[PDB]
Design a protein around this ligand. Structure first.
Ligand SMILES: *[C@@H]1O[C@H](CO[C@@H]2O[C@@H](C)[C@@H](O)[C@@H](O)[C@@H]2O)[C@@H](O[C@@H]2O[C@H](CO)[C@@H](O)[C@H](O)[C@H]2NC(C)=O)[C@H](O)[C@H]1NC(C)=O
Ligand SMILES: *[C@@H]1O[C@H](CO[C@H]2O[C@@H](C)[C@@H](O)[C@@H](O)[C@@H]2O)[C@@H](O[C@@H]2O[C@H](CO)[C@@H](O)[C@H](O)[C@H]2NC(C)=O)[C@H](O)[C@H]1NC(C)=O
Ligand SMILES: *[C@@H]1O[C@H](CO[C@H]2O[C@@H](C)[C@@H](O)[C@@H](O)[C@@H]2O)[C@@H](O[C@@H]2O[C@H](CO)[C@@H](O)[C@H](O)[C@H]2NC(C)=O)[C@H](O)[C@H]1NC(C)=O
Ligand SMILES: *[C@@H]1O[C@H](CO[C@H]2O[C@@H](C)[C@@H](O)[C@@H](O)[C@@H]2O)[C@@H](O[C@@H]2O[C@H](CO)[C@@H](O)[C@H](O)[C@H]2NC(C)=O)[C@H](O)[C@H]1NC(C)=O
Ligand SMILES: C[NH+](C)CCN(C[C@@H]1CCCN(C2Cc3ccccc3C2)C1)C(=O)c1ccc2cccc(O)c2n1
Ligand SMILES: C[NH+](C)CCN(C[C@@H]1CCCN(C2Cc3ccccc3C2)C1)C(=O)c1ccc2cccc(O)c2n1
Ligand SMILES: C[NH+](C)CCN(C[C@@H]1CCCN(C2Cc3ccccc3C2)C1)C(=O)c1ccc2cccc(O)c2n1
Ligand SMILES: C[NH+](C)CCN(C[C@@H]1CCCN(C2Cc3ccccc3C2)C1)C(=O)c1ccc2cccc(O)c2n1
Ligand SMILES: *[C@@H]1O[C@H](CO)[C@@H](O[C@@H]2O[C@H](CO)[C@@H](O)[C@H](O)[C@H]2NC(C)=O)[C@H](O)[C@H]1NC(C)=O
Ligand SMILES: *[C@@H]1O[C@H](CO[C@H]2O[C@@H](C)[C@@H](O)[C@@H](O)[C@@H]2O)[C@@H](O)[C@H](O)[C@H]1NC(C)=O
Ligand SMILES: *[C@@H]1O[C@H](CO)[C@@H](O)[C@H](O)[C@H]1NC(C)=O
Ligand SMILES: *[C@@H]1O[C@H](CO)[C@@H](O)[C@H](O)[C@H]1NC(C)=O
Ligand SMILES: *[C@@H]1O[C@H](CO)[C@@H](O)[C@H](O)[C@H]1NC(C)=O
Ligand SMILES: *[C@@H]1O[C@H](CO)[C@@H](O)[C@H](O)[C@H]1NC(C)=O
Ligand SMILES: [Cl-]
Lengths: 527, 527
């Protein structure tokens, strides 16, 4: 039996066996007041203590979110669906401490991605027990409000001020500050890591003064705040909150009145209107996301980033070889999960209208013009691969590289990785390649379980990546100093070096997607 | 009726139709007295003038040489076999002139390879008409003596001095100097290029003072004198010359008297015992090659290269991705052009004994130790590919990288390529990849013949290569300045940059097969 005295109640956790050892898990510890009724759409509220001992022995509630019903019965899309029960009462977090209890362990806080609309910490691919046993770190992950319940914004009005899901994560960060010493953790050695919208969340903690004292280092996997989907403007958030209010018949005009209307509406009524708040939509739509609230974010994040207004520390950033394929099968002509998905120049042209709906016909031609200069025209996949590269480059790879350059320019060590290994278990067809999201399994060390149908090489790669991530969390340098490994060099603005990750040969390369990222990061913003 | 007046007499060419244009061809101009009877085993004698008109309208005889008959009817091996009569009367050269006759055109002199035992200028892949047509350069090629008929050596004896096939080449370079202006060539703009033994020949012309005035620049494809096979030691030349005279049964004591025998026996008796002249032999055996003779070569070539004793000019150097596979299907256990040649570790250890015969078990152990550190031990091809890399890295790639380095260090511009495109018409099996010898057709512009079943992209590649080669010859810089090509940087000892060549995307990379070539160049010579 393991009880831990936290500053507001005793907490009892389980024991697991992992590769012939013990890891103590504490699943579902509450860190915030249930944000129900009158606390809905508000920042998370402190907690009231309990002399009751709490049984943190089961994954808690995922927060309210629509679910991916696009491929019923498909492991590829349903593995991202929530695996506990939806509820507004969902502001819990999990902890994983090694056994024997560590003395001063480094802490890894996971922040799940999605599109600020979906996600939960209880998914199998985020199971922190492997990292706790293999590397003797402490893994903490938390649930945070997503969708409108987490990011509906009426600016300045404290009844719905925006960025509630970010203050959820931030509050879970202070919990780890106040309590992780009781678990044998070092609050002065804390690394945030995250994927997709979790990665964009990690970058915004870098920019938010209230979070600066609550972590040490940052890891950003396939995402950053400067990605075109990650920050919704002050005007977009107004039209989007009014349109949601109309679509619930809550169109008051006293501002705090049209919120009290939504507080009484049903969570399911809000989830179903959410989709229809913007006219034209994309598979990368983020209808309620982070805004400039003047509290978590004091200014437009790209100004803060360009003018050096962020925590000075180490960052580890990277992307996958085919970030963009996943989004094609959710609404691009000729694209399907069961079809090798060769498309025509006209289908490629139609795909551009889908993903860049507001862009002019000039911009849609620029994209066509630049991405289409291959050599061999007698090969079918040109346009198919082209669109995946288009979407992956625009939405993830080029912003991620841009964040890393601007961050490194103020004298911080940055490390960039190019993850290019296709999962031997990947449920999606092979034409989709190394997909968005499908490096996470390797960070959490799932292939370290031999009874799991991963390659023995996938065990080696995942072991290597786990060590590189743990060395970065502990020591700020993501090297593997023992198995004759490729040295991972710093990313500097001048030469822009990055490490590739795969099972064949890990290489140092420079200037990843150099021509493409110039087109996106310099020319296209003028368009 | 195109007749040109060479300094030796009038010569009659012939018009060729090429790509809607005309190319004037002079095939088989004699450039020395036939090395017959008393001239056998001697440096080439000058040519006596002729009051006639010489009809240079067909290819001349190829020099005497054994022939590859391991794959009867197979184009892959037979395409390298001679396609004219064999004869000791073989000292002829070919000349391709653009039409209209050029004013002062750069001259490209080809030197064919083949381990100094085989080869001829008349092969289809050495057809110079496409270069004369597309880039309006003059192309010259010569036949030179091979095997013991061009490299039998007893140091000192001018009856059999050694390097007589190199002096053949040199005499052809001399012919171009005296006569090419009659055809519209610029004798001050002569680039040597060759492949394999031809490339190791070009490299020796760089180190040989007698040849320094006969050319301007140099191109070396898959070969250099510093390759393990390309220079015969005086100790070996001594044993091998003698061991031949015993195999033909006329060992004598007066050293000028044992040559008098060999000058009697007819060619086929010599060719029949050349192979048994060395005890154990490998597919990379060069029984009669270049030696240090104090005439063409005044010292050990490795010493001259190390101490800056060579013509100072630009060089273009490169290798193919899979230089070593061609040699495996000729005696390496487990390998055949007809099965996929998945070998096992025991067969790999046998392949090392085949290819490194007189090397200590220690040396064979470090080869096995260094080359087997792959990640995924559960891959069938590991040993198949490993042996190909062993043979490729030891015999071609590492010597070429070492030659380019040591050459660049004395102030001159060097350009290194890495050819990694597999011809769509390549007759050998797919596991052999980008084989030794199979960049030549792209350098000679065969894929520019649209009517020939090469892909459209292979035409685009072969065009870009042909322009780069021509620009190197004309201007010393192998860049492609018009069609947005990748800039080809200079090879410097510290950076070691090279350009990859393929149909997908040309990349600048650095330090090719660095870990492998550190083994072969630095450590292996000590064992
Ligand atoms: C590849 O498949 C897509 C989508 O197809 C799915 O699988 C098929 C077997 C079929 O049963 C479809 O109904 C499935 O949705 C094909 O897509 C076009 O896709 C759009 C998308 O809605 C659809 O409206 C069109 O009618 C489809 N066109 C046709 C002729 O069916 C795509 O054309 C297939 N391409 C190839 C090369 O096989
Ligand atoms: C800001 O909001 C308005 C509201 O548009 C309606 O659209 C529905 C999908 C739903 O959200 C409903 O609650 C809302 O009232 C947008 O006006 C629309 O713009 C499109 C494109 O210009 C027009 O075709 C529509 O006529 C119009 N909608 C209707 C039916 O009134 C407006 O576009 C939006 N501004 C943006 C995109 O920033
Ligand atoms: C230098 O030459 C001798 C000569 O060896 C004979 O080998 C035949 C294949 C043929 O060339 C014949 O004319 C010649 O006389 C080499 O001696 C041989 O060495 C091997 C290996 O050490 C022994 O197994 C043989 O007994 C011996 N040959 C015979 C039958 O006499 C000698 O090796 C060689 N030196 C080298 C390799 O540099
Ligand atoms: C690929 O082929 C090689 C070579 O085998 C030759 O001989 C016959 C079996 C013929 O059918 C043809 O396949 C080929 O020309 C096989 O390797 C081995 O070759 C050595 C040569 O000395 C023989 O000693 C072995 O018997 C032979 N192996 C076998 C199966 O007998 C090789 O096995 C094969 N590899 C495959 C199938 O992947
Ligand atoms: C680890 N991955 C991150 C999880 C999967 N995906 C991205 C995929 C691919 C295409 C978009 N479907 C969404 C599934 C879903 C569920 C409910 C409502 C809509 C949709 C479509 C899943 C996401 O959770 C996801 C969803 C939206 C995003 C928006 C912008 C950027 C992103 O990364 C986004 N990611
Ligand atoms: C770093 N390891 C221990 C080795 C696996 N090589 C190294 C490469 C892959 C195989 C070929 N050369 C050899 C280097 C060399 C030196 C002299 C002569 C020949 C050769 C060839 C070594 C990796 O790059 C690699 C790739 C992915 C990994 C993933 C997890 C863990 C690893 O160690 C990983 N290593
Ligand atoms: C353009 N290529 C260069 C022409 C072909 N080949 C290389 C191949 C490699 C495998 C062995 N076959 C034949 C074996 C054989 C048997 C009887 C008569 C001739 C041949 C060659 C040749 C060569 O002519 C060749 C031959 C010997 C070499 C020795 C050392 C280095 C080389 O590059 C060598 N190249
Ligand atoms: C220089 N050419 C004319 C073009 C072919 N590309 C260039 C690559 C091919 C793949 C796609 N990106 C584009 C660069 C870019 C910029 C903005 C947005 C998207 C993209 C993707 C360009 C070659 O690298 C190449 C490779 C082999 C060749 C062989 C012969 C002749 C050639 O031109 C060859 N060119
Ligand atoms: C945990 O490690 C931390 C530092 O990583 C230690 O706590 C502090 O130690 C630093 C030394 O770097 C001091 O400057 C601070 O003053 C210490 N903290 C405070 C609040 O004073 C500590 O030694 C370790 N704790 C363990 C092992 O229990
Ligand atoms: C060269 O050919 C001569 C006859 O053939 C040619 O005659 C030329 C005058 C011209 O018409 C060409 O078009 C013909 O092909 C022949 O008399 C000479 O003897 C030949 N020269 C040698 C050295 O044999
Ligand atoms: C916590 O779990 C243990 C299981 O043995 C139980 O004894 C205890 O009563 C539980 N506390 C609860 C459910 O409040
Ligand atoms: C290093 O390699 C050995 C296998 O040779 C493995 O057991 C060990 O876990 C590896 N360590 C890391 C950090 O990858
Ligand atoms: C050709 O060029 C050389 C120098 O490159 C020059 O000396 C010679 O006179 C020129 N001959 C011509 C143009 O006929
Ligand atoms: C330049 O582009 C044209 C247009 O297609 C092409 O025909 C030509 O071969 C290219 N030149 C080179 C040197 O590749
Ligand atoms: Cl790139």
């Amino acid at each position: 039996d393991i009880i831990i005295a936290t500053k507001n109640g005793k907490v009892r956790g389980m024991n697991l066996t992992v590769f012939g050892g013990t890891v103590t898990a504490f699943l579902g510890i509450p860190y915030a007041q249930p944000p129900l009724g009158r606390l809905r759409f508000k920042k998370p509220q402190s907690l009231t203590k309990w002399s009751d001992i709490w049984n943190a022995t089961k994954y808690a509630n995922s927060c309210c979110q629509n679910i991916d019903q696009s491929f019923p019965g498909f492991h590829g899309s349903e593995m991202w669906n929530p695996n506990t029960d939806l509820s507004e009462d969902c502001l819990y977090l999990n902890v994983w401490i090694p056994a024997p209890k560590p003395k001063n362990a480094t802490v890894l806080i996971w922040i799940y991605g999605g599109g600020f609309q979906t996600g939960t910490s209880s998914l199998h691919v985020y199971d922190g027990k492997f990292l706790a046993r293999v590397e003797r770190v402490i893994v903490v992950s938390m649930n945070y409000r997503v969708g409108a319940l987490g990011f509906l914004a009426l600016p300045g009005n404290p009844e719905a001020p925006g960025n509630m899901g970010l203050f959820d994560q931030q509050l879970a960060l202070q919990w780890v500050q106040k309590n992780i010493a009781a678990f044998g953790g070092n609050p002065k050695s804390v690394t945030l890591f995250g994927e997709s919208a979790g990665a964009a969340s990690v970058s915004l903690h870098l920019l938010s003064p209230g979070s600066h004292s609550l972590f040490t280092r940052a890891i950003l996997q396939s995402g950053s705040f400067n990605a075109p989907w990650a920050v919704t403007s002050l005007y977009e958030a107004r039209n989007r909150t009014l349109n949601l209010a109309k679509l619930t018949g809550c169109s008051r005009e006293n501002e705090t009145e049209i919120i009290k209307c939504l507080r009484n509406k049903d969570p399911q009524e809000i989830l179903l209107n959410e989709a229809f708040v913007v006219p034209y939509g994309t598979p990368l739509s983020v209808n309620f996301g982070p805004t400039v609230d003047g509290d978590f974010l004091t200014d437009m994040p790209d100004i803060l980033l360009e003018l050096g207004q962020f925590k000075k520390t180490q960052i580890l950033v990277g992307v996958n070889k085919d970030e963009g394929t996943a989004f094609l099968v959710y609404g691009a002509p000729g694209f399907s999960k069961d079809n090798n998905s060769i498309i025509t120049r006209k289908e490629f042209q139609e795909g551009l209208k889908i993903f860049f709906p507001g862009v002019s016909e000039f911009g849609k031609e620029s994209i066509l013009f630049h991405y289409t200069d291959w050599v061999d025209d007698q090969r079918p996949e040109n346009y198919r691969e082209a669109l995946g590269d288009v979407v992956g480059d625009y939405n993830f790879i080029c912003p991620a590289l841009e964040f890393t350059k601007k961050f490194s320019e103020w004298g911080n060590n940055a490390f960039f990785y190019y993850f290019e290994h296709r999962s031997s278990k990947l449920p999606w067809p092979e034409w989709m390649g190394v997909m968005h999201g499908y490096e996470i399994e390797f960070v959490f060390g799932l292939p370290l379980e031999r009874r799991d149908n991963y390659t023995k090489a996938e065990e080696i790669l995942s072991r290597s990546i786990v060590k590189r991530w743990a060395n970065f969390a502990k020591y700020g340098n993501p090297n593997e100093t023992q198995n004759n490994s490729t040295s991972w060099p710093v990313f500097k603005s001048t030469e822009q070096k990055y490490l590739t990750l795969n099972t064949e040969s890990t290489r140092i390369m420079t200037k990843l997607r150099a021509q493409q990222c110039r087109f996106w990061t310099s020319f296209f913003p003028k368009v």
